[PDB]
Amino acid sequence: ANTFLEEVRKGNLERECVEETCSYEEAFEALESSTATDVFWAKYTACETARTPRDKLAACLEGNCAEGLGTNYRGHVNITRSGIECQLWRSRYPHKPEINCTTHPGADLQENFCRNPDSSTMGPWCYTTDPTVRRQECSIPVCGQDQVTVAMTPRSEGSSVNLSPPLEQCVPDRGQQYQGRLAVTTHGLPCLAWASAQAKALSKHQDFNSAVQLVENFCRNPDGDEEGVWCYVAGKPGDFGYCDLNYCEEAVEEETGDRAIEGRTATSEYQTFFNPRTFGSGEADCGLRPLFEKKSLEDKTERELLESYIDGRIVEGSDAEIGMSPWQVMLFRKSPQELLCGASLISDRWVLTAAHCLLYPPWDKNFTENDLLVRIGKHSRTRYERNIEKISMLEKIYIHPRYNWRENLDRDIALMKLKKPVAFSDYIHPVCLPDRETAASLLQAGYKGRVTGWGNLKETWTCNVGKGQPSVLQVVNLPIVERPVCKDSTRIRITDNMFCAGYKPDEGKRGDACEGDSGGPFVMKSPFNNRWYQMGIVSWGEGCDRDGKYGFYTHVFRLKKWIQKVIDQFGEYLE
Ligand SMILES: *[C@@H]1O[C@H](CO)[C@@H](O[C@@H]2O[C@H](CO)[C@@H](O)[C@H](O)[C@@H]2O)[C@H](O)[C@H]1NC(C)=O
Ligand SMILES: *[C@@H]1O[C@H](CO)[C@@H](O)[C@H](O)[C@H]1NC(C)=O
Ligand SMILES: [Mg+2]
Ligand SMILES: [Mg+2]
Ligand SMILES: [Mg+2]
Ligand SMILES: [Mg+2]
Ligand SMILES: [Mg+2]
Ligand SMILES: [Mg+2]
């Protein structure tokens, strides 16, 4: 095609095993090729149920139809039978495919269509972008005949005569101002009674600014938590539960209601709000790096932190600076070894990463407490540094109620505890804490964000050829992205418990709007008080897989009181 000699051969061949029959050695005569020989075979025997006529045959090997089943089919359709888009033929989000990128070159499993290189027990399928379902078949005509192999299902969103119909109007103040009768939660669980047998005798040393009455057995929020209401449950002695419900669009960026200059004069001012014996340390002393904040030493990228400094360019992966986040933490598997996820640090005894990292069945995984291990304050991922870095075990799997992997990583969050605690050092030092009221005032002004890692985020999700992971950590700053802007980027609907965070992107590239460690850190530094206030965990983003999208990481500002409760509960399973 397109020329003389590559064309020339075409004619000879339209006639050989098409209308007549042919062979290996017959093919190997007029062919003049070694490997190309088998480009044929895939589609040929795929169309086993038609040797003659060429008329009926026509569509099969052209590759826009299903003969019998459709191993001839290489055709191009974005979607599957129902509606929610197919997955690519290499990226592993949401469900991991069993067929990874190296295995089948026969079908040439690239792009995002529907394939069947392997003997399906129903028909030609592709993986979905919905988590509820792993794979499904798709709807193509017969080869040389008009007949869809499978039916469609549309699925839709209505209003005042399709749904039921409902229309509420929202709950203000994030759970305080509510009096309701509900007793159903996320998994499908109940409440327990506030003045019966187990909702008074342990309400012992806690902040009860009690305006609302103690009524019966519903979900409430009298403390003043900024998430919402919750009530109690029971099992292998453990958790309570936030009752799942629709809320307002009360964002933290610019709350409406009634270039600037620099300041410093202060060394620690904060709200001592947490219980240092069972909870322990990390509350006052945090985010004041041993090698930087304390000496008043900067790093290369503090000078540049403003939104309007040099009016927008793109930045590359930099071989990063030593010990400048001594709160960095790894994650691995027992027998055998395996690099799993990224994380983040706060105290001598408490820990964090993003909740995807274990309880996600599509990769077959109830890896309970003891499948696991950690290494801390590291640098050269290829090496071990023994002294500077250290080793401690992890405790138990504390489930956050609102985490929904089946849905769409909505509240991608949980908690754990260190087994043996750890000491404060040059190489070892935690990061600091902004509440809602801190978080809000911060983000109106023009400043930047930061994430780091060994490209473990960049690693885990796709195949990604050539670009081998950096054994040293990677660093680079990032800008803010407005809420008026971010929406129309993607047509799939968006949440206010996550955020857009990436550069102004380009056409022909994968991009670095997606870096660091998965479950890794989304950190910052205060000009108020010189502390290091974090504002997210490094979770998945469209930018990783989907070209020309943004670096995407999780919110933090709401749940001040979730763990305020937990810290007294830690001690109750002891001895
Ligand atoms: C399949 O998904 C494609 C992504 O590779 C989409 O391609 C884009 O489509 C827009 C128009 O909607 C173009 O302007 C843009 O240049 C790009 O090609 C596309 O929506 C979709 N294709 C089909 C056939 O549905
Ligand atoms: C994992 O399996 C164990 C026993 O096989 C079970 O008791 C436990 O409930 C599971 N994990 C979680 C978090 O439910
Ligand atoms: Mg012919
Ligand atoms: Mg011969
Ligand atoms: Mg021959
Ligand atoms: Mg011949
Ligand atoms: Mg011949
Ligand atoms: Mg020839």
Numbering used by the authors: 1 to 258, 266 to 582
From the study:
In this study, we report the characterization of the prothrombin mutant proTS101C/A470C (proTCC) in which kringle-1 is linked to the protease domain by an engineered disulfide bond. X-ray crystallography and smFRET measurements prove that proTCC captures essential features of the closed form of prothrombin. Locking the conformational ensemble in the closed form with proTCC produced crystallization under several conditions in only four days, yet crystals diffracted poorly (to 6 Å) despite several rounds of optimization over 10+ months. Crystals with size ~0.40 × 0.40 × 0.01 mm3 were grown in about one week at 4 °C in 100 mM bicine, pH 8.5 and 16% PEG 3350 for the 6 Å resolution structure. Crystals showed anisotropic diffraction with 3.8 Å resolution in one direction and 6 Å resolution in another direction and 3.8 Å resolution in one direction and 4.5 Å resolution in another direction for the structures at 6.0 Å and 4.1 Å resolution, respectively. In both cases, the structure could be solved by molecular replacement using the structural model of the closed form generated from recent smFRET measurements in which Lnk2 (154–167) and Lnk3 (257–275) were deleted due to their uncertain position. Structures at 6.0 Å and 4.1 Å resolution are superimposable. In this structure, prothrombin folds into an “L-shaped” form in which kringle-1 and protease domains engage in extensive intramolecular interactions. The domain-domain binding interface is dominated by the insertion of the aromatic side chain of residue Tyr93 in kringle-1 in the active site of the protease domain. Due to the low resolution of the structures, the binding interface could not be rendered in atomic details.
